């Protein structure tokens with residue numbers, strides 16, 4: 001509901017703290033997250049999980065979560081069942097959070113806590129993904145930056 005904590009640990013150091021306050025009453029989620037990462041950009045936050053492992057999400061790879069924004073658009077439309085924002089890392093791995101007007105976006109449709117985020121300093125696009133299947137699923141680097149995300153309160 002009111003706050004969330006994200007904890008990511010990868011092969012490359014990726015660390016950030018994303019906190020999102022949503023409620024089923026419908027309202028823009030006030031969310032803040034900073035990411036530190038290897039040198040790259042980042043575009044789109046498209047998480048899609050039902051919980052796997054905070055060291056790398058196997059389920060988060062090729063699994064589309066349609067409840068999100070139907071495809072998972074970054075601004076959200078319904079219940080982006082993943083973290084919603086746009087973040088762009090610099091060469092020093094530092095991404096400022098774009099806080100978008102979301103509707104019911106708690107990161108996860110089956111639940112939130114335990115759900116592993118798939119983002120990285122990379123375009124983790126929503127509806128475009130990358131290649132046809134990744135377009136469908138909405139890009140995921142299963143272990144590129146993954147950790148259990150969830151509303152921690």
Ligand SMILES: [Cu+2]
Pocket residue numbers: 045046047048118119124125138139140141
């Ligand atoms: Cu992704």
